[PDB]
Amino acid sequence: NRHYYSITINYRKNELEQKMLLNLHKKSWMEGLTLQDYVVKEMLELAK
Amino acid sequence: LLKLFTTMELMRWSTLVEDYGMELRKGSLESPATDVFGSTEEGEKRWKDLKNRVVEHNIRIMAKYYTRITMKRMAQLLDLSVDESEAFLSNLVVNKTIFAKVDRLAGIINFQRPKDPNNLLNDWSQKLNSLMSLVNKTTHLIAKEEMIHNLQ
């Protein structure tokens, strides 16, 4: 700790990108187009 | 005969009998004919197994429109008789290399596939893959419509 005192850090106000850091993410990470599974049988067969 | 390698050429058997009996009537290379139909205990047996060919390969090719077909109209669309078709059904069906289902309860039965006894699997494939094709529709709809709208 002598010669090493830590400094409070933080991240930037990133909305300038955080917007595009979630918009594109949420839109894609969630079925992209989202018109895809709308898997529905073979999955519940094994499920049940 | 090379054309026969597609659609089976469900041809009037006597027409092919012409096409391959005039081989013996060749004013040219005819040793083909004698190797094929200049023979009797096998050449005529070659005609017989050729009947076998036409019937069984027609069974092969016609497997599409089935699940409704009559024993009589079978022969009608077979270029061979009904009890001829009876023996052909018999041999191909005890050979049973394919799985059909037939009965003279009606005689209207067919050289079928498993006759679709399946559950949702059919519906599953259909719904899922079709809907998927539809999302593909959308995803290239945007693209190609934009492309045709590029100049504008």
Swiss-Prot record, chain A:
* Tissue distribution of the protein: Widely expressed. Highest levels in heart and skeletal muscle.
Q: List the disulfide bonds.
A: none
Task: Tell me where in this chain the PTM Phosphoserine is found.
Answer: 28
Quaternary structure and interacting proteins, as annotated:
Component of the 19S proteasome regulatory particle complex. The 26S proteasome consists of a 20S core particle (CP) and two 19S regulatory subunits (RP). The regulatory particle is made of a lid composed of 9 subunits including PSMD4, a base containing 6 ATPases and few additional components. Within the complex, PSMD4 interacts with subunit PSMD7 through their respective MPN domain. Interacts with TXNL1.
The protein's role, per its UniProt record: Component of the 26S proteasome, a multiprotein complex involved in the ATP-dependent degradation of ubiquitinated proteins. This complex plays a key role in the maintenance of protein homeostasis by removing misfolded or damaged proteins, which could impair cellular functions, and by removing proteins whose functions are no longer required. Therefore, the proteasome participates in numerous cellular processes, including cell cycle progression, apoptosis, or DNA damage repair.
The Swiss-Prot or TrEMBL record describes its family as follows:
Belongs to the peptidase M67A family. PSMD14 subfamily.
Supply the name of the protein.
26S proteasome non-ATPase regulatory subunit 14
The source organism is Homo sapiens (Human)
Gene designation:
PSMD14
Curated annotation (Swiss-Prot), chain B:
Question: Residue limits of the PCI domain?
Answer: 1-116
Coiled-coil residue spans = none
Residues modified as N6-acetyllysine:
64
Q: How does it assemble?
A: Component of the 19S proteasome regulatory particle complex. The 26S proteasome consists of a 20S core particle (CP) and two 19S regulatory subunits (RP). The regulatory particle is made of a lid composed of 9 subunits including PSMD12, a base containing 6 ATPases and few additional components. Interacts with ERCC6.
Purpose: Component of the 26S proteasome, a multiprotein complex involved in the ATP-dependent degradation of ubiquitinated proteins. This complex plays a key role in the maintenance of protein homeostasis by removing misfolded or damaged proteins, which could impair cellular functions, and by removing proteins whose functions are no longer required. Therefore, the proteasome participates in numerous cellular processes, including cell cycle progression, apoptosis, or DNA damage repair.
Sequence similarity = Belongs to the proteasome subunit p55 family.
The entry's linked illness reads: Stankiewicz-Isidor syndrome: A neurodevelopmental disorder characterized by delayed psychomotor development, intellectual disability, behavioral disorders, mild dysmorphism, ophthalmologic anomalies, feeding difficulties, deafness, and variable congenital malformations of the cardiac and/or urogenital systems.
Q: What is this protein called?
A: 26S proteasome non-ATPase regulatory subunit 12
- Give the residues of the full protein shown: 305 to 456 of 456
